[PDB]
Design a protein around this ligand. Structure first.
Ligand SMILES: CC(C)(COP(=O)(O)OP(=O)(O)OC[C@H]1O[C@@H](n2cnc3c(N)ncnc32)[C@H](O)[C@@H]1OP(=O)(O)O)[C@@H](O)C(=O)NCCC(=O)NCCS
Ligand SMILES: CC(C)(COP(=O)(O)OP(=O)(O)OC[C@H]1O[C@@H](n2cnc3c(N)ncnc32)[C@H](O)[C@@H]1OP(=O)(O)O)[C@@H](O)C(=O)NCCC(=O)NCCS
Ligand SMILES: CC(C)(COP(=O)(O)OP(=O)(O)OC[C@H]1O[C@@H](n2cnc3c(N)ncnc32)[C@H](O)[C@@H]1OP(=O)(O)O)[C@@H](O)C(=O)NCCC(=O)NCCS
Lengths: 332, 332
């Protein structure tokens, strides 16, 4: 069974509201009219009234909720709260009226205030433009130094990871993580694995080196980050530096890194930077026939996800479903 | 057919001589006889005629020529040769004579001075010990900044590349190649692919970014190496900064990099550093169930190859056949 089928089913059990801002694109409506249709969640649409019922065509959205930045009965405290976290960044009140009238923003500040549980977009903008709303308004969770991105990778005939399932991170967002930032990526991705795959994360800090099989600036960066992460999170089994083969293969691990809590069992792969992360994941997907999921964001304070530039609405129902389960990571 | 068999045949039609210095290892001798029996190459065994004779017992090594570094006709000219090379890097004439009694130093000089077409060692020495004389004696071909290590990769049920075969560089040796280094690795890799795989090289300078989809020091690096490589070798197909998906999958190349010489059909992967290179090759081998060949070295003035220390006498046969075809790039 599919990770996304598993997830979307778990996501139906919950009750969560997802504010989709891309209300001028007709995919973000094909998506919208299947959320309410399967019980995946409830879902806000952020944008002009003239768009909705006229654009998509004939699809039932009475189950949906329309809120325009210039219609809602609370729109005033949005130009105000935005101006409270841009309180240090040069933008006045009518500039806080220029930025906010955009749909992405209103969908994001609704999350910050708990009017909405989460946000999915990226499909019609990019991964530069999308994450600003996610950073400036939402900010991050407490046990989190940054917003990062990741991918769930399912490898077909595979006796590695968690039944062929892995989290790769960061493979989306963070171009050049510093050693501090890497260590945190490990910790935060462990909690995401647990949440989404529902298995014990064994986190591998990757490298061409394995426990000093080589030595350079590169290795030492990872070395350090392993050991930073091992402190941040003692309860989480975390090791580095590991090559991939030692990371996943008992026989190999047994000789390259004897008595490791991770080597030979890995299911979370952590990369030195985004050349590595993004190469690794595409290589899995295309040469290993792995199914890939993401980019999904993590370490955020309330879930807000990005989308591959070009995609279908069936992917979006996927993303919306993850934004739900994610949305059930703190409320307890 | 498998890559290795293609290679062995070509080897047999060629007329190359390979030196084997690891003559106190019984796998080298076993490999030797197999290679002669089959017609894969001529052999110079470098070592002690009494010891080989005493070690070989039931092996038909009579087609081989045995050369003893301490009694060979040309000994004293090999020593001068080494002296000239290292004069200015501390070595004294005395020091030369002692270094040059090393079977493996001798065999590399043989190749340098034209008595052998290449050398295979590594079965009973570390890679550093094998690669030091290579890079000191035979040095590099015509000023490529450097020698590098590559893999030939065969993915099983793959449409991508050249029948799911690829060349990965550098995935085993140069750790932090400079921007120039990466440029050089691309050019040399393209010639190697053409030679060994026998198909038009189409080289992907890899990244997490496709056509300036993201900007950073990493991306700037890749672009600069892309741009220098095109200057270094204009008639070879080399492209921008490319993601793996944009590089091998024509439908994604149809989106992210239209009209590229490389994108959609890449078959040569150049990585930014050895984290990427190794992690990528290991994902391919382990999760993709790719067959992977060597680290094989390139960019030297004559082929020199290092084996794994747990190789079989048959792995040696194959390393010897790669090395002969590598030696076909020379000639006259
Ligand atoms: C424009 C960009 C290249 C410059 O990076 P930046 O200066 O850090 O981010 P921006 O200028 O867009 O926005 C400002 C905020 O974004 C934040 N942001 C970027 N990366 C972050 C991270 N992973 N964790 C938390 N916040 C982050 C910065 O911390 C900054 O906050 P500050 O000004 O109060 O200190 C880039 O952030 C972008 O296009 N955003 C997409 C996300 C991304 O890829 N960022 C990595 C760039 S180094
Ligand atoms: C040992 C090492 C860390 C030190 O670097 P170095 O002193 O510059 O090189 P080494 O001591 O290993 O060997 C001597 C030569 O290697 C050369 N060299 C290093 N990398 C090379 C490369 N990949 N291709 C060709 N020559 C290379 C140096 O120019 C040096 O020449 P010199 O003695 O005439 O000045 C490193 O070169 C090394 O690991 N070399 C062995 C093979 C290897 O693993 N190379 C990876 C390079 S990052
Ligand atoms: C040997 C093997 C099983 C595992 O090796 P590994 O420890 O994971 O190391 P990598 O494959 O990532 O390659 C880097 C290693 O190659 C060595 N190496 C570096 N430069 C090299 C070069 N230019 N040529 C040959 N070896 C080199 C390095 O020393 C390094 O570690 P080492 O000290 O253990 O040798 C691996 O190479 C492999 O998967 N090959 C399978 C069999 C094969 O391809 N045939 C080889 C013929 S002997």
């Amino acid at each position: 069974v599919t990770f996304l089928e598993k997830i979307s089913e778990r996501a139906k059990k919950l009750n969560k509201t997802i504010a989709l801002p891309e209300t001028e694109d007709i995919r973000t409506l094909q998506a919208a009219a299947k959320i309410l249709e399967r019980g995946i969640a409830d879902i806000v649409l952020v944008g002009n009234e003239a768009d909705i019922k006229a654009l998509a065509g004939d699809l039932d959205l009475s189950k949906a909720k329309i809120v325009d930045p210039k219609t809602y009965e609370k729109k005033d405290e949005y130009i105000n709260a935005f101006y409270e976290l841009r309180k240090h960044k040069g933008i006045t009140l009518e500039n806080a009226a220029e930025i906010m009238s955009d749909y992405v923003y209103f969908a994001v500040m609704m999350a910050k205030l708990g009017e909405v549980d989460g946000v999915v977009s990226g499909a019609a903008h990019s991964s530069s433009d999308t994450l600003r709303p996610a950073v400036q308004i939402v900010k991050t969770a407490k046990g989190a130094a940054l917003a990062s991105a990741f991918f769930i990778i399912s490898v077909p005939d595979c006796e590695y990871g968690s039944d062929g399932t892995f989290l790769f991170a960061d493979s989306g967002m963070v171009e050049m993580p510093s050693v501090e930032d890497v260590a945190n990526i490990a910790v935060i991705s462990a909690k995401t694995f647990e949440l989404l795959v529902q298995d014990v994360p064994k986190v591998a800090m990757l490298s061409y080196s394995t426990k000093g099989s080589a030595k350079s600036k590169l290795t030492e960066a990872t070395i350090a980050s392993t050991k930073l992460a091992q402190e941040l999170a003692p309860d989480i089994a975390i090791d580095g530096e590991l090559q991939v083969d030692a990371a996943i293969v008992p026989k190999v691990a047994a000789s390259k890194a004897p008595g490791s809590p991770v080597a030979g069992k890995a299911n979370v792969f952590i990369f030195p930077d985004l050349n590595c992360g993004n190469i690794a994941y595409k290589i899995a997907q295309r040469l290993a026939k792995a199914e890939a999921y993401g980019p999904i964001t993590q370490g955020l304070a309330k879930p807000i996800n990005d989308l591959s530039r070009g995609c279908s609405d069936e992917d979006i129902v996927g993303a919306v479903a993850i934004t739900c389960v994610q949305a059930a990571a703190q409320d307890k």
